[PDB]
Design a protein around this ligand. Structure first.
Ligand SMILES: [C]C1=C([C])[C]=C2C(=[C]1)N([C][C]([O])[C]([O])[C]([O])[C]OP([O])(=O)OP([O])(=O)O[C][C]1O[C](N3[C]=NC4=C3N=[C]N=C4[N])[C]([O])[C]1[O])C1=NC(=O)[N]C(=O)C1=N2C(=O)[C][C]C1=C(F)[C]=C(Br)C(F)=[C]1
Ligand SMILES: [Zn+2]
Ligand SMILES: [Zn+2]
Ligand SMILES: [Zn+2]
Length: 747
């Protein structure tokens, strides 16, 4: 009469007495003998009678199983089996007592389906969906087993979450390939800029994670998930979904737990992992970031990561970002800024009636997943997507026919295409200045083709040339042909380019809120010999801490303004000197009325066709600073060779030359005098001296990576000049501070 066993089917199982969790069949083995004891985990087994109850065609619960099967096979890629069925449909739920000093795990009865409402409110031995004696009872012994690694080793199937908050975003994916149950019959309200997941077979979008693939740095930290990442993916994806669903408060483990819905003891494992994973993504700045603020005893990282102190040099976006991160983590942070204000190259003039005019940055280039878009969401502020339209207006007042604009843009880009071909097989030593290579290709193309451009077509080509010089912040003869667009090899920020109407100052101010910031404290010296870094200001003040982070602009690193002891390495100096310190300047003009409205007809900007290639980049674009079209403020830009021509002019002389230009651009009409203006002088600001970085002839994009290497795990570097993927921008500077705060916290 066949054979029967007390013991589990799996050699090495730690259950000395399997007991059937199902009790689905009339002849369930309860806790005795059966023809096979089917193993789900070390703590969960079901007898063969209950196995036949669902499996065999002549048995009762066969319709229930066959129906689940059909749902399973059509929505998922994971095979259906009785074990998979049991784990998705028959294992009981486990929940923690929500009383703070208890937190004990309990098994719910079978008919109860775990809601996030139950998980938020459950207390020991009180019937859910609803004395303190029931808390003192010991947990089921199987609970403690779960937290060992060998428990996960002995788990036969990975968990599949139900009703994950991630699910509305992952519809393009098989639910089980991203850790969600296929038997689960279930993005309005989320910010259009939060797109944290790639769609399948999609790349080239910055800061998107693949919802079905762990990343290298994730596998490094969680190698136990390398073979089968189902479970890690489920929890990471859940945390991301929860964060972007509410980026204005800190996302705690307490907050994640009631959204982790899975049957069986494995839920305990998930609740224990979510917390580890959460602290990891916090340190890495993927969540719980932006201008989020925490109070005392509400720090974002456990007291372990708290045994450090940091001095941060420079209170620009990179410095304040690291300071805000490190502070939120619970690390002592002091920021020493040279100037008498924070912000660095973010400095918003607020004195123009009705608008905020930035003397430094005010544009966000690519808003999807951009942390600046995150921080705007957190602050409730709005960004203005730039319009496409930008007439090229001639001195004289003629508006250049758009087909000329477009045709010369074509020829121009066709020149850059030849550079990209030429450079493919050339090393850093073979490099050649970009402008020089363009002139060669152009003069070769003119000579070969016979074509003859009108004067205007040539001037319009000069305009497109000036824009490139603006993007590099340099005449193109200092810019590397090989490596000027180096960072476009990496995924870039998709989406809208915007004018940050309220100005970056609003973000910079909120980042700095509440931090120990010593202004008028320019750092003279950093000595990282000895047990602690010693930092000294220009008047002799001394500050001390265990680690120091440097965010000074590239120009200041090039000029050696801070004495380093020991000196920076030769490798680091060569990198620092291989990047160029690009420069632009800005002028803002306020008028008594919007004199351009009739001609410009609402566009966000208009173009200034340069008269000659010498005057190239002199007020090339005028920006209308009020997207609501009520106030009268224009802003324009000096780039390229034009920067060196106006160093010997005072502000009034620059203003006059701008006004002469506007009046030529509007020659057929009257232009009022300006009533208020400013002219920036970044290139002579002693502690900045630049607008943003670029790669000079002979250098490589790797220069950014090299400038970013820490020294002795003790001196760290951040700043736009240190972000290889995202050079130049406030965004790239911000992310580099987060990057460095992640490095520092790791110790
Ligand atoms: C200038 C400018 C202008 C005029 C304009 C613009 C700009 C600029 N940009 C840029 C930005 O801003 C930058 O990049 C940033 O900011 C960076 O940051 P960082 O890194 O943080 O730096 P800074 O800020 O500079 O800071 C620094 C600091 O530190 C200090 N110091 C120094 N030294 C020292 C100190 N302390 C102490 N001790 C010592 N020794 C100083 O003071 C400071 O504070 C920009 N950006 C963006 O994003 N956007 C915009 O819009 C901008 N801009 C314009 O306009 C345009 C440009 C652009 C680009 F570039 C790119 C792109 Br794709 C775009 F979209 C745009
Ligand atoms: Zn049974
Ligand atoms: Zn077993
Ligand atoms: Zn309890």
């Amino acid at each position: 009469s066949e054979k029967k066993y007390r013991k589990c089917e799996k050699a090495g199982c730690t259950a000395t007495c399997p007991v059937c969790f199902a009790s689905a069949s009339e002849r369930c083995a309860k806790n005795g003998y059966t023809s096979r004891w089917y193993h789900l985990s070390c703590g969960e087994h079901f007898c063969n009678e209950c196995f036949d109850h669902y499996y065999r065609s002549h048995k009762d619960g066969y319709d229930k199983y066959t129906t689940w099967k059909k749902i399973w096979t059509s929505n998922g890629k994971t095979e259906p089996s009785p074990k998979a069925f049991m784990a998705d449909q028959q294992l009981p739920y486990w929940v923690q007592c929500t009383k703070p000093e208890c937190r004990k795990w309990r098994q719910l009865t079978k008919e109860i389906q775990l809601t996030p409402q139950i998980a938020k409110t459950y207390r020991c031995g009180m019937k859910p969906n609803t004395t303190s004696d029931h808390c003192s009872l010991p947990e089921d012994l199987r609970v403690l087993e779960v937290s060992n690694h060998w428990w996960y080793s002995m788990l036969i199937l990975p968990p599949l979450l139900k009703d994950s908050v991630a699910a509305p975003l992952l519809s393009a994916y098989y639910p089980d390939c991203v850790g969600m149950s296929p038997s689960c019959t279930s993005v309005p309200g989320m910010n259009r800029y939060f797109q944290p997941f790639y769609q399948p077979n999609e790349c080239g979008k910055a800061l998107c994670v693949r919802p079905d693939v762990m990343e290298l740095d994730e596998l490094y930290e969680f190698p136990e998930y390398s073979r089968d990442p189902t479970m890690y993916l489920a929890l990471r994806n859940l945390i991301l979904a929860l964060w972007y669903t509410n980026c204005k408060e800190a996302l705690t483990p307490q907050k994640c737990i009631p959204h982790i819905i899975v049957r069986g003891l494995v839920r305990i494992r998930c609740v224990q992992e979510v917390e580890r994973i959460l602290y990891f993504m916090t340190r890495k700045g993927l969540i719980n970031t932006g201008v989020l603020s925490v109070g005392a005893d509400q720090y974002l990282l456990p007291k372990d990561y708290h045994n450090k102190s940091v001095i941060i040099i420079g209170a620009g976006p990179a410095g304040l970002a690291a300071a805000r991160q490190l502070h939120n983590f619970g690390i002592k942070v002091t920021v020493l800024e040279a100037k008498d204000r924070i912000g660095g190259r973010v400095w918003d003039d607020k004195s123009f009636k009705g608008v905020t005019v930035g003397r430094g940055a005010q544009i966000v280039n690519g808003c999807i997943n951009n942390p600046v878009a995150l921080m705007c969401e957190q602050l409730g502020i709005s960004m203005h997507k730039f319009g496409e339209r930008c007439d090229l207006i001639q001195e004289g007042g003629r508006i250049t026919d758009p087909t000329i604009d477009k045709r010369m843009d074509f020829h121009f880009n066709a020149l850059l295409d030849v550079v990209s071909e030429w450079r493919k097989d050339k090393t850093q030593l073979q490099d050649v200045p970009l402008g020089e290579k363009i002139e060669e290709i152009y003069k070769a193309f003119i000579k070969e083709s016979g074509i003859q451009f009108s004067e205007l077509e040539g001037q319009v080509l000069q305009f497109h040339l000036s824009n490139l010089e603006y993007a590099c912040g340099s005449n193109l003869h200092q810019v590397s042909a090989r490596s000027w667009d180096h960072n476009e090899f990496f995924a870039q920020f998709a989406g809208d380019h915007t004018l940050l109407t309220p100005g970056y100052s609003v973000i910079i101010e909120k980042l700095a809120e509440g931090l120990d910031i010593q202004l008028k404290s320019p750092v003279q010296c950093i000595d990282y010999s000895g047990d602690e870094v010693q930092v000294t200001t220009t008047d002799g003040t001394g500050y001390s801490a265990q680690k120091v982070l440097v965010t000074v602009p590239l120009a200041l690193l090039q000029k050696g303004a801070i004495q380093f002891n020991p000196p920076l390495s030769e490798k680091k100096m060569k990198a620092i000197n291989s990047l160029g310190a690009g420069i632009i300047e800005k002028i803002a003009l306020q008028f008594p009325y919007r004199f351009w409205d009739s001609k410009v007809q609402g566009a966000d900007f208009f173009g200034h066709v340069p008269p000659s290639a010498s005057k190239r980049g002199l007020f090339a674009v005028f920006y209308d600073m009020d997207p609501q079209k009520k106030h009268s403020v224009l802003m324009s830009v000096i780039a390229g060779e034009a920067v060196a021509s106006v160093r010997t002019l005072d502000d009034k002389q620059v203003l006059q030359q701008c006004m002469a230009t506007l009046r030529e651009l509007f020659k057929e009409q009257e232009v009022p005098d300006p009533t208020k203006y400013f002219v920036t002088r970044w290139s002579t600001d002693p502690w900045i001296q630049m607008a943003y970085s670029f790669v000079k002839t002979g250098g490589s994009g790797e220069a950014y990576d090299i400038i970013a290497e820490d020294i002795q795990g003790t001196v760290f570097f951040a700043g736009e000049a240190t972000n290889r993927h995202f050079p130049q921008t406030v965004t790239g500077a911000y992310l580099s501070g987060v990057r460095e705060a992640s490095k520092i916290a790791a110790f």
